[PDB]
Each structure stands twice: as C-alpha cells, then as structure tokens.
C-alpha cells in the first residue's frame, strides 16, 4: 500500500485569474512514471488537460489549453504542477492526476490514479 | 503474493521490439563470451569442426527494475524467449543446415535489470584443417560471433575471456589454447561499422 | 457439468510465469526420477550411448486446489504444455543436435494440486567407452540432470531412486546397476549454487 | 450453489460516528480468496472502499479512506469487517464486498459478488 | 447459408480441454484399430522395424448434436487439430528421435457426434530379430498403443480387429498374421490401472 | 427460424403474494440448453434471478433472491418456471428468459434470448 | 488505397473451416494436375523413387468476389495458408519421415474467386524395381493422390493431363510417359465413395 | 521516449497482406544480388552443389516513414519476420529436403522507408557435373531466384552484380566467375511473364 | 463512394393500420448482402425487426412481430420491404436497415448501414 | 507536441443558407494523414459527416448529407475544407475533425483529435 497522490489548490476565482494546482506522490519510484493531468465536468466525460512524458521534456498540452496551462514536474519533492493563467468560464471541473509506466505522455496504460479537486471560475 | 504483482506490473508499456536504453541516441552495451565443454569431433574428410559451448551474453535492461523493500522477497525474474528484448548473435561460419543451433532458454533479471543469457548448443563450426605434418599439427580453428541487424552506433559489443575450467579431456586432440579479439568491420551492404568477436581454438594433436 | 465449470475456474488469476509458491521467500520442492526401458545402443567409434527413458518429476502447485464435495466426480485434471509452470530440467552433457529430446506430454493434477509429469524420451548422451580389456569390461556412463535458470533458493531439487523394472535385457551389455547421487556446485556466472542429479549406468560386456 | 455472501450493519448516523460493516461468506473456501470492498454512489459508479489479499496482511485503502476506515477479515468465522470512523456527508452510498481467487486485492479478476447494504450520513 | 451457421453455434461453449462425457463420473469408450500397408523394412544390424500404418481411434462427443431438419444439407463437419479434444494414444515401444511420427489430420463428426480419427503414419517400432534359424525364421514383433494420461476410469480402451486388406506384398518377409490383444497393466507411478492393445506382427522369411 | 420464447403468468399483485412465471420454447432441442431467468427494472441493468443447467440439477439462485423463488424445468412440455413467494415492493421489473448452449448456469455466452414481461407489487 | 480497403472487406464474415460452395448440398469441384521437374534418384536397394515435382490444383471460391470497376487497379489478391479454405490432398503411397514434403506457398485469387494452388516439393514415393532384365528395363512407378477427409458428395476431384515441359533429361533412366487416372474407390471405414488420381511415370534404363 | 512512440505509430492501420505502393495500378521495384562465401562441397556420384550465401533483397516501403526531427535519436527501425511485407523469393532448382534453406531474420528500415533484407543461407543447388575431362573441367552451376506468387505487372525484378568479397578459397575446386542474368518467361498455369534471375557460378579443377 | 441506402414509407397511422416500409441501395452488389432491420425508441436501444438471408430465404423475425411483420427483397430493384399490419401503439420508432457481407440473419458483423425514417402509431 | 488542430468557421445562420467550415493543422506531415469529419449534438453520439483519403480523390459522404454538403483538402496549406449548403434546422451541433494514419476516409484507427466548433440553424 501507501500508493497515494494527494492533490490541492482548488478553488474558486473570476475569470481571468490564476492558479497553482498541485499534486504530491509517495509509495512508489517516482522517477519511473509519467504524470498526465484529466479533468471532468459534472455533465461529461474525461479529457486530457496536460502530459509530461518520465524523462523529463515531453510536455503535450491539449488544443484548447496549449496556450495558457504549463505543465511541471520536481522529482526531488516528488510532485507534479499545472500552473493555470487566463481562465474562462468554462474551465470548471473536478482536475485528477494518473500516472503511468515509463510512458510518453500521450495515450499510455495508467496504473495509480489520483484523488479530485473542485476548481471554479 | 508479491511475484504475482511484479509480473504483472512490470509488462505494463512494454514494446519487445524496443531497443532498451535511456538515451536513444547512445550505444548499449553488451558483454560477450563463450564457454567451452569438450570437443565433440573435428572431422578431416570435410572440414567442420562439432563442440559443445555455453554462449554468456550480458546486458542491462532499463523497463525492468523495481524496489525489494516494495516487493519483499522477490529479487529475481525469469523471463522466457519473445517477451524480453533478446540480441540477435549468431555464428557467421557455420556449416549446420539450420546456421543456427542454439537451443533458447529463459532471461535471467535482477533488482537492477542486468539481464544474463547462457544459452547452450552443439556448435558445428567450419575449420581448415592440414595434414602436412600429419604426425604432429597444432591446427587453430576459429569462431566469429556478431550481431546480425543491429550493429555500430546502436549495439557496442564487448569481449570477456573465455571460460574453459569443465572442459573435459579429449581423446586424440588436446587443447592449448583459446584466445579471443574484437574487430570491427565495413561490409558492402551498410555504411557503418559492424563489431564482431573471434575465438581461436588451438589444438593439438596426440 | 462440473467439469466444465473446474477448468473455467482453475484458471482465473494464473500467470504462467509465476513459481507456485505460498511463501514467495522460500524454495520450491521438485522430485526427481528417471526410468530407464531400454539400451538401445552404445556406439564405440564415437562415443555416444542412445538410451529410452521415461523422466519422473513431481512438485506441488498451490493455486489449483478444489473441493471435491463441491464438483462432485472431478477428481483430477490434465493440464498441456503452456498452460501450467513446469520446471526446466535439462541434461546438461547431451549429444543430440537439439540438445533436448523430451516429447512434452501433459501435466496430471490431482485435488490437492499434486502434479506429475512423465516425459518419455530416446536420450543421446556422451560416454567414455574404454577398450583396454576388450574381453570383459565394466564400462560406467553418467547421466546429469538439473535446473537451468532455477537454482538455489528457489528450486531445491531431490532425487529417487531409478526404477528398473520394466527393463528388456539387452544383447551384448548386460546391466549392473543405475545408482544416483546428489550434488551442489557453484558456477562462474551466478554465486548461487546450483543441485544437480547424477545416475550412473554400469553397462558390463557379456 | 450455496455461494452466498450477506452484508449486514448498514443504517444511518450523524456526521463523525462510528460503523461496523460486516460481511459473512458460505458456499466457498474462504482462505483461497481475497475480498475487496465496492462503493456506489445512486448516481455515480463503482469505486474502491478497500481491499485485503488471501494471504492476510496486505491492506490497502483508497486515497479518500486512507486515514478514516479499516479493513479486516476473519477466517475461523468466515467473515469481513470494514470499520468506518469519522464518517462525512458525502459517504452515502450501497457498500457492497467481491471476492476473487487468489489476488492481492488491487484489480483482479472479481468471480463472486455480494449483496449491496445502505449507509446513510 | 447453413454451414455457416453451425460452425458458429457448435463451438459456442466448449473447451477443448473437458472429456466430452455427459456424466463425469463414468468413463468414456475409445475403439481402437491399426491399419497396415506395407512393411518396408526390417533392419537386422539394429532392432528396427519399419512399417506404414493408418491408426483409427472412434469415439462419441456430446457436445457436437445438431439437427439435419433445422440445419439441411449438412450432415459433417471436420474439425481440425487444437479445437476438439482428441485422444492421446502413443507408442510405447518406439525407435524415432522425436517418439511420434504420426500426421495429424482433420477428425470428422456426424449428426449424432460420433467422430472418426484416422492419422497415418511410418512408425519405427523396436522388435529383437532372431537369426539362429537363418534359412527360416517366424519372427514376431510387437506394437504395443495405449493412452498416456488418461487411464483407467476414465478411458476404457477397447480394440477391433487390425484390417490387412491393402497389403501390398513385400519380397524377402511374407505376412502370416496381425493378431491383437489388450491388457491392463498396473504402473508404479499411480495407482490406478492403465489399459494398452498389444498387435503382435509374424513375418515369416522366404 | 421459429426458435421463439415465450413468457406468461405476469400481472399485479399485492405484497406477500404468488406467482408462477412460465416461459415456453420451441425451435430448438430444448434437452441441450440450460435457461436463466434476468430482470430489469426501469431504471436499472440486468440482473440475475435463478438458472438451471442443461442436466437437471444445478439450480443457482440470487442472494437476495435466495429463500423466496424456485426454478423448475419440463423437458417433456418444453418449459420453465419460476415460483415467486412472499413477493415484496422492489420486485417491480421485466422478467426474461435466456438460453444458452450446454452449460452450467452461471454466466454462460447466451444464444437465443427471450421476450419480456411485467411484474408489478 | 484500395487494395487496403479490399484486404479489410474480403474477411468481414469467414470461416476457414466452411466449404467456399453457394448450394451446400452439392459438391465442390477440384481440379488436379502434377508437373513433373527432374528424376532426381531411383534406389533400387531399397524401394523409393525421388521426384521434383509442382502440384497444381484448381476451385472456385464463391465469398472472394468483388467489383473491378468499385475497386479499380486490383485485379488479384494473394492469401497466405491458415487463412483460407484449401483442399487436403496428400500422397497415399509416400516414404518420407513426415509423411507431407510439400512447401505451402500463397493461394491467389482474381475478379471471380478461381483460386490456384502450385505448392513445390521434392517427393519420395514408394515403386518397385524389378532388375529381371538388368540390361533394359521399362519401370512404371505410380503416384497416388486424393483427399484424406472430404471425399464423395463434398469434393469431386477432377484430373487434367500432367506437363512435362520443363523435365531436364536425366543421365540413366529416360521418360516414356506420365498417363493419368482418375478412380473411385470404397474403404472399409466409411461408406461413401473416394476419388483418387493415380500418375504412372515411366522411367527406361539407357 | 521516442523509439517506444515510433514503434507504435508506424503500425497504426499496416496490413501485412498488402504490398506497399502508392499507386496500385504499378509495379513495385524489388533489387536482387546473392553474395558467396564459400563452397562447401561438390558432390559427382550424385549431383548438388553445396554453397554459404548471403541473399540481399532491397524494396522501398511507403507505410513506414518518419520525420527525424519529431522523432529525434532514431533513425532505423528492425521488423521480425511476419509483421511487414517481404517478397517470397524461392530457389527453382533445390535438392533440399525443405525446399528452402533460409535463416529469417529482421528487415532493416531507415528515415526514407528503403528496406534491407539479407538472409543467410546453406544452399544446397542441383548442378550437372561433366567428367569427361576429368584432370581439367571448367564445370558450370545455375542458381535460379525468382517469385513464386507475384510475379509481372506487379513486382519488376531487378538484379544486381554478385559480391564475391570475402571468398574463402577451396581446396580442390576455383572460382573463376559468377556472372547474373535477368530473363522473362511464360509459364502454362498463368498469361502473365514471370521474371527472374539467374547466377552461373564457373568452377574450375584444380 | 455511392454505397447510400434510402428508406421510404414512414409516417402516421392509428392502431391496426398497415405500413410498406421500403429501403433502396445502391453503390454495392446487391446481391451479397444480407438485409437486416433495425428499430431504436426515443427513450431505448436497437432491437431486431427482421432479417433475410443473402440466399433468399431465411427470414428470421423477432419474438414480438413474428405473427404481424413480413420482410421481402427484391434483387432486380435492388429494394428490401417490411410490410407492417396490425400496429400497436409501442410501435413507435425509427427503422433502419443494415447491410452485411454473406451471412444469415441473425447476429454477423454488419458493414453498410442505413439512413433513420418515423413511424408512429 | 505541437501536433494541433484547429477548427474555424462556426456560428449561426437560418434554414436555407451556407457555411465554410474550415480546419488547420499543424505538427505532422499533413500529406500521410486522412481527415474526417464529425458531428455530435447536445444530447446524441457522434455521427460521421464526411471523409478524404490521404490519397486525394475518396471523398466519402454521410446518407442525409449526400447532396448537400462538400469536403475538400489542401496539402500545400496544411487545411481542409467542409462546405455546408442549403442548412436544415435538424443540423445543429458540434463538427470537429479527426486524423488518421494512412487510410481511406471510411472507418479506421484516428490518432489526432481536434476542437469543437458550434453550427446552429
Ligand atoms: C544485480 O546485478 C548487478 C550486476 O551484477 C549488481 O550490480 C553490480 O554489477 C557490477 C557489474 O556491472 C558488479 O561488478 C557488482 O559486483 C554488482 N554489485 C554487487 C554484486 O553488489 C547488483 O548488485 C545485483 N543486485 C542488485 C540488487 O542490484
Ligand atoms: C493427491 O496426491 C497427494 C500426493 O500423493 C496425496 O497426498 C499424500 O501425498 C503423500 C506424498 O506427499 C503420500 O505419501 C500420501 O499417500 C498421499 N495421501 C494419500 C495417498 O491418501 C493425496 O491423497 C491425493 N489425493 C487427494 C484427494 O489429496
Ligand atoms: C452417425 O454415426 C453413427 C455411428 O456410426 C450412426 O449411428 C449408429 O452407430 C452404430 C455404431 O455405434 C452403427 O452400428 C449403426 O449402423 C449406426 N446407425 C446407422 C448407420 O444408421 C448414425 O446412424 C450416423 N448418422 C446419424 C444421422 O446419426
Ligand atoms: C478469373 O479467372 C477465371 C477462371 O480462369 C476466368 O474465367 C474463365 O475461366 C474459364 C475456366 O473455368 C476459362 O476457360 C476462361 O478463359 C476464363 N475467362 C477469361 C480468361 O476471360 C476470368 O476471366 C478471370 N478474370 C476475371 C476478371 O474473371
Ligand atoms: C535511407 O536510405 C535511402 C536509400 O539508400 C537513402 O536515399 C538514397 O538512396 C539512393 C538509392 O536509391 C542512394 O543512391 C543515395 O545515396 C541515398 N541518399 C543518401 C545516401 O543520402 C537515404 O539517404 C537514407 N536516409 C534517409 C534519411 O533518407
Ligand atoms: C541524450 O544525449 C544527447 C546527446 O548525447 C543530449 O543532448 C541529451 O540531453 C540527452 N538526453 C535526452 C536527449 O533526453
Ligand atoms: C524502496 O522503498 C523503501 C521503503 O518504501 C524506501 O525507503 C527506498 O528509498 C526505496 N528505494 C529507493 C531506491 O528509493
Ligand atoms: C514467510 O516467511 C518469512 C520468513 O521465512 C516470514 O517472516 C513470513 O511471516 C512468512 N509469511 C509471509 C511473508 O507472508
Ligand atoms: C468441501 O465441501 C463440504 C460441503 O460443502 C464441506 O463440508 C467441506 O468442509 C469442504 N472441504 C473443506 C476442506 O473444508
Ligand atoms: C451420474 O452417475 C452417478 C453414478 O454413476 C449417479 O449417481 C448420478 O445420478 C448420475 N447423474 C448425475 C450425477 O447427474
Ligand atoms: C428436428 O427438427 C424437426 C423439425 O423442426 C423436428 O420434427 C424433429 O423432432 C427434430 N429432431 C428431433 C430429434 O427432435
Ligand atoms: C439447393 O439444391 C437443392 C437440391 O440440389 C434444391 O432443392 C434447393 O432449392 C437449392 N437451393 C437452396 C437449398 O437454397
Ligand atoms: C461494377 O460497378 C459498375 C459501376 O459501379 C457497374 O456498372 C457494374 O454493373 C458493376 N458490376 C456488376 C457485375 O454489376
Ligand atoms: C495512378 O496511375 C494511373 C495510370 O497509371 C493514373 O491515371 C492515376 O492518376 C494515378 N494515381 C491514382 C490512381 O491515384
Ligand atoms: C520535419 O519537422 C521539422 C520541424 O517540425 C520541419 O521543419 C520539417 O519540414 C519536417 N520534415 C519535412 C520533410 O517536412
Ligand atoms: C550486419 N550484417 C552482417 C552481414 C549482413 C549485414 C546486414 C546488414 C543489414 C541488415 N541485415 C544484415
Ligand atoms: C550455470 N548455469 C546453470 C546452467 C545454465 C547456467 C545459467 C545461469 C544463470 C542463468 N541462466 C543460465
Ligand atoms: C505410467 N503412465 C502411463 C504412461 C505414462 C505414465 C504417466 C502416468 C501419469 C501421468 N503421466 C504419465
Ligand atoms: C480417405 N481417408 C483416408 C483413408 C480413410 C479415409 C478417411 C475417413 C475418415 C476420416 N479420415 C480419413
Ligand atoms: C509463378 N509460379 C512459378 C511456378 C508456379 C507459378 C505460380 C503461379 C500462380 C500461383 N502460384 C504459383
């Protein structure tokens, strides 16, 4: 056990703000795992947000965020950031990491998942 | 069970026909020796020589390591042939019908991922052996291993000394030797370098 | 039927890959016992001598157990090659081309996850064939049999003794005895020692 | 047949009591398998509560349940026990246990299911 | 068309792996019969006798009924190997490195589920050629078939009469009978007795 | 064509009743399929409520379903039935037959299923 | 492309195991001719003739058929063995330790599904040499071939003239002829009639 | 990294069963040249001519390109055998027991999708050997490569001049050339011209 | 392209009328094909209505409509039919026909799907 | 990254009138892929509306879009083009484009998605 990844920084704010979701990990190597950010909306499905491949420099975003979500990563604290600027009012869903194997970042097979988060703009 | 776990977390994203290093623009490395254990026959009328060998290739694996203190009491996996990236090393003179008489076993792996393969064979080699002293000849036949596809700038082979410490005496031909070079080649087909790794048996006869 | 339902269950969470163990921290029990039919040639010019054996292993599984009050008539089931863990013993002084001539059959199991397995086999293996008293000899050839990658604190082998009792007297060489030995030894490559089984074949010329 | 599961202990209670979910099996060999614990919410999906595997000691809890419920289980008498501490306002839902030959409590292959149970806060 | 639906409806729920009995706990019925064709060599030197053969095994699936009235036009379906459960009779007594020379074939299945298995084969049996009458001997040889797990309780074998009406003569050994007989045999290894058909071949010399 | 089944005996009835659902076959061998009953509710998915195997003697019941109802099978008139008692108010949903080829009862690859029914407490 | 989109459409609904024919209460048609290549050996010491032979049979598939004009540029697809229905027709009279020399190749298919079928193999058969007349001698060798399973009411095997035009003249024995025949003949397992086409090569001393 | 996303974009929609060509109103392009290493045996009493042979064959895929700078590190990518088209190229006139003699191996790809295919081979021809000069002949061999399926209108052979590079000198006989031709011939079972090449090896007594 | 299939024949009709649902296909051989109808409810899933075999004849109807629909083809129009008589009023769906390589009937992977038409009750 | 896809062209206009909806893309070799196109509504699936092969010359229409509306391509560019005529009130929903390796427009295995767009009539 002890598998755990513990999200924070939800919140509420108006649209046009700014926010430093985070996600912290324990109980396993986290220099083997590839970190992928989802989101889902209270009356839809899950969509990817961000992805950063294990290596260290494979950042893919999505189409409607790829010019205002960055994505990060620190092996040394053993956590994962999606720094969010310029959000709109449709940016409101539950946000949930996922790990996943040495992987690319894109679609893989995701092994931990994470707990949610309420943001709202 | 914990190996129940680990085998089926390790062969979560894996693609056997991955090269398996960190770094996809350097060299892996993987280590080369043969270990004798008698020699079968060598044959005059033709020119083959038949042994029995161990082949020892060594490399380290990336995708396959895990934490001991996570997976108590596990600390080796054994993993059978076309589910672990194996080198492709064969035997450029041999003489079998089939060119390739080794007989596959499983991939040792440990808490590291260095990765051992002993397989073992009946080698039917092709020699050059001469008669011009028939009373006394100190005949040298040789073994040259190397990869088949990969080679240069993708698989760095290396050698390690051979290993004849069973070999068990034969009747008319007695060893004196076993040394071994690396080389490395230019072949018409391809531009870059190809490594590759000969044994010289020396024997002698009685 | 019942049958039907057993073989649909047995199987739900089994990896073929995984050594059935309770405790993944100690080491299994394999018992092993050839059996010897017949000598079917003892050539001299080589030195090579053909034998029919019928292998004899017997280890127990831990994830194939049942209730045979709960499937009724089901009282054992047969499992093929491929479908269950199977140790891999090899003789490790073999003169045949494939270096293994084991006809794999299947694996019998019984309501306690008891299994056996009774490969049949026409083994070549390699003897040293003296001349020196060609009127009356006695003429011992070995049989080596062990694990190749388990060893050692994994698989502790164990020996039986032979069972010559459906043996067809031979022409020339008549029998004397078929007895084993167990031993330990350490290998180059690994640190782990490794048993092994030998029998002793005592061929004496009539 | 006879393979029969019964879950029992369910009711409602305030926000931070107590529960002792109970779980009783028959029809099977209670030792050879490993029962995990389902949670569903009225509309929502399945979700993981806890797990033990068939050896004994090898819990593990959901992020969620982490530092609030137990898991136990008792061969002599054929049970499961989910003790549930502190409980909140968002744990209502059908509990319900799932065996499955021998695993190790994370995802397997489920072969018997059980009868659901409401908890109420 | 409807052979195409019923090559999807009769292997709906089946598993190759399950004795095909309607009460699992009572044996199923084999019949068993060996066909010649010709002897082509009998090998004095060695203790080999060379021989064409077609087996014919006959038993009756339960899974396999349909009806002709819903289904017209089709009355057979064939089946190949690795889909249908099919006895495993060996040759106890053989001579071939690879111990089964048989070629698998398609079994075939009527509206009532009795199938029908007819592998050919060139068996390499072992019989002991006695020359001590040279100018006339009356030398029999066995061929000894029998099932290698399943035994006793499970599957009663029952044999018919070998049929010698393709016999192409042979020049120097003229046939004088094929006679059959079944035992049942108690082994050591379990406990349960095992059923075998024994034909015994008498070629006189000419 | 003509492999039809179909339901009778449905209707209304108060809490702590009787009934006698029966379904008939025809088209196919009826000796050499094993029939399980499933019921829908409105709002729900199917679930389980009896089976029977091909040879006679095999009955699996539901948990919760485990005391009230019976299964029984006719071979010579080409029919099952499935005795209700002590009927209570959850109860309510489509009651239908599925076929399968020979097998046990448990989940099976059903082949020719069957047409619906209303039941109502 | 296209010939993807053909590839992808043409395996919607198979079944390898179903008969390609519309009606299925007719029989499929085969047609059957061998091409003969070189004489490679007649051993007289034993009984076996080695032949370098070209099979070449002939059907109509009937769910391979497409549109030309909807599919433009693919006039012809090629299927690899495993994948679609092809006849079993083997050598009733063979010599070889196997039993089946021939080498499975592709089954090509045009506009309207006519399949052909020229597996190569070097055959051994099985003649008799008579040497009563060692100075000239006029030896006739047959080659039977037919359908193991489908025979009568399923597949009507039809015979073409055999093509000898591309032999290579060997050095002993010279070619007279290669006459075919087709024959139906009952066995006593079934009941229903099997075809068969026998080939009677003609081989002069010199 | 990036070898593990090329592997599995390169085989998103890739059916094996298609030839890789834009246009499939075209011929594909395929380049033959054989490599010699040395001959093993030239046997007179029969007639085969055993030789060691490196095939290389050379076409241009269309489903397999990349770009290097998105896919940074990789340049070439190595198929096993059975997941990418390769052509089925056969020796006409073999005297082995296989018919084929050829090692499979791994087909090497680069950036631009040229592929490289050179199996190993112990080929075992059949040749005419003339001693009606026995103390001096200039015997001739044929080795005749070809398609066995596809053949004119859809795959345009072409050859390539032989390598004899790293020839190792026989005992008894030398080489004196080895000149290739390409011809286009009309076969009975088709309409349409089969190319192929043939290699004519000249081997002098010493 | 070109392989379009048009339905005709929707519309209104009170309980126990008639109805000559007709479907017309171009762009494939007609001939290698297997007709199969397919109705789907506002409110639930596609369910069978009928199916005629590439042969000709070997109409498989459904439990519910055995005795009152009747399919048909016709290879020289390249048309299929369902007629429709006595219409109840939960006969109220879209139809649609789909297509399928040679095959039976019942249940085949299906290729060439059909456009949706109303028919009400 | 960088493989993105961005639709244009959206908005509202009454029955009866037209539309150039248009989509770039970047990141990939744009002449080794086959775009189609795909419609969603608010409350129904996805639904095909058009497709091109890789090649040029595939165009593959939906049933009820056969006569109106046209697809095109332009390599040099890196864009593809769906040009709506006569707009009924039924066609009303989200069209996003889908990529694929090597293909010819009908049912295939897509890589890259792109971004919703709204049409209303
Ligand atoms: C697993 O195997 C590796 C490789 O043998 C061990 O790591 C070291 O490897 C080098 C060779 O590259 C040896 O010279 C060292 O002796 C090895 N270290 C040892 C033996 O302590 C590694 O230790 C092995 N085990 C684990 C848990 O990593
Ligand atoms: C199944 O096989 C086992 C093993 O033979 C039987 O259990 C005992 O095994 C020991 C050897 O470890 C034997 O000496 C005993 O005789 C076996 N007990 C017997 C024969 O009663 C076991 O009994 C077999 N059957 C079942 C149902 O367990
Ligand atoms: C299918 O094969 C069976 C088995 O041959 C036929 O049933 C009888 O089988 C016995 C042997 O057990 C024969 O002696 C009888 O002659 C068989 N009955 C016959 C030949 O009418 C069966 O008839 C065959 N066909 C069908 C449709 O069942
Ligand atoms: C495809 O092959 C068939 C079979 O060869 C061709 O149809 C005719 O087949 C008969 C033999 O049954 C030949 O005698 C005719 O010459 C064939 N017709 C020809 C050659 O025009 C068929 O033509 C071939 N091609 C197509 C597109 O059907
Ligand atoms: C990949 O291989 C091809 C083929 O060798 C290279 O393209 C040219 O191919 C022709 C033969 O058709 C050679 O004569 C040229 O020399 C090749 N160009 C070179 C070597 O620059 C191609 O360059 C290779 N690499 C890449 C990245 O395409
Ligand atoms: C890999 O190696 C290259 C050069 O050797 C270096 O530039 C790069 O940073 C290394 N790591 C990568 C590419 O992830
Ligand atoms: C393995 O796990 C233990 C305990 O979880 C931890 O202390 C140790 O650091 C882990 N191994 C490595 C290499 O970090
Ligand atoms: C397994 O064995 C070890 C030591 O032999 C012991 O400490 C442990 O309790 C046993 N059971 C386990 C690990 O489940
Ligand atoms: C097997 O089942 C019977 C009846 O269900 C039960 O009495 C018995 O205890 C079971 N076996 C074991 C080992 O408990
Ligand atoms: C099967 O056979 C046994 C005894 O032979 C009998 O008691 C039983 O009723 C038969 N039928 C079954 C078990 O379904
Ligand atoms: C086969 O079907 C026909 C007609 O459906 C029926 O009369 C006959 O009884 C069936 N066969 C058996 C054995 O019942
Ligand atoms: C098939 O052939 C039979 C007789 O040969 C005939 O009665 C039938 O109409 C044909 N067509 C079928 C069965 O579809
Ligand atoms: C093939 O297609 C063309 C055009 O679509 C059509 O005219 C022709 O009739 C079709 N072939 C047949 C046999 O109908
Ligand atoms: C293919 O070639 C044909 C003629 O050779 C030409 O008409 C066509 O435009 C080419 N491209 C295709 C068919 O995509
Ligand atoms: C490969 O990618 C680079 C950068 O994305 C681009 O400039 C180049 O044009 C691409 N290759 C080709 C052949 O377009
Ligand atoms: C490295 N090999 C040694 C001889 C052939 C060469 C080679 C090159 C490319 C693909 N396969 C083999
Ligand atoms: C020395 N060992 C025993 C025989 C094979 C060899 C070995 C060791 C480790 C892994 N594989 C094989
Ligand atoms: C003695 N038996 C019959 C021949 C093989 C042997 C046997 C027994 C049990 C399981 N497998 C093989
Ligand atoms: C033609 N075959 C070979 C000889 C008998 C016949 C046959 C009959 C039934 C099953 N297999 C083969
Ligand atoms: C082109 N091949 C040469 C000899 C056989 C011929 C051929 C023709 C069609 C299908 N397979 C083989």
Not at chain 1, 85 to 107: H, I, M, Q
Not at chain 2, 82 to 95: E, H, M, R, T, V
Not at chain 2, 153 to 174: H, K, R, V
Request: net charge neutral.
């Amino acid at each position: 056990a002890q598998v755990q990844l513990v999200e924070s920084g939800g919140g509420l704010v108006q649209a046009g703000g700014s926010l430093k979701l985070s996600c912290a990990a324990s109980g396993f190597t986290f220099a083997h795992y590839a970190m992928v950010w989802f989101r889902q909306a209270p009356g839809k499905e899950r969509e990817f947000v961000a992805g950063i491949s294990w290596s260290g420099a494979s950042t893919y975003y999505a189409s409607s965020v790829k010019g205002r979500f960055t994505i990060s990563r620190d092996n040394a604290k053993n956590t994962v950031y999606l720094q969010m600027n310029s959000l709109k009012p449709e940016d409101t869903a539950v946000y949930y990491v996922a790990a996943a194997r040495f992987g690319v970042g894109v679609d893989d097979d995701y092994s931990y998942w994470g707990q949610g988060t309420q943001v709202t703009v | 069970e914990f190996q129940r776990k680990l085998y089926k977390e390790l062969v979560k994203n894996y693609n056997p026909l991955e090269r398996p290093v960190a770094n996809d623009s350097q060299p892996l490395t993987v280590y080369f020796s043969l270990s004798l254990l008698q020699i079968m026959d060598v044959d005059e009328k033709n020119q083959v020589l038949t042994t029995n060998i161990w082949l020892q290739m060594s490399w380290t694996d990336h995708y396959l390591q895990w934490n001991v203190s996570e997976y108590p009491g596990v600390k080796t996996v054994r993993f059978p042939d076309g589910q672990i990236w194996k080198p492709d090393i064969l035997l450029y003179n041999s003489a079998d019908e089939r060119f390739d008489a080794t007989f596959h076993t499983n991939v040792l792996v440990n808490s590291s991922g260095h990765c051992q393969y002993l397989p073992p064979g009946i080698f039917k080699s092709s020699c050059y052996i001469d008669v011009r002293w028939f009373p006394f000849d100190v005949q040298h036949c040789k073994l040259k291993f190397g990869s088949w596809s990969y080679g240069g700038w993708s698989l760095d082979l290396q050698m390690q000394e051979a290993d004849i410490s069973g070999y068990i005496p034969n009747g008319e031909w007695d060893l004196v030797g076993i040394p071994g070079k690396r080389s490395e080649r230019f072949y018409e087909c391809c531009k870059e370098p190809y490594p590759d790794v000969t044994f010289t048996v020396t024997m002698r006869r009685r």
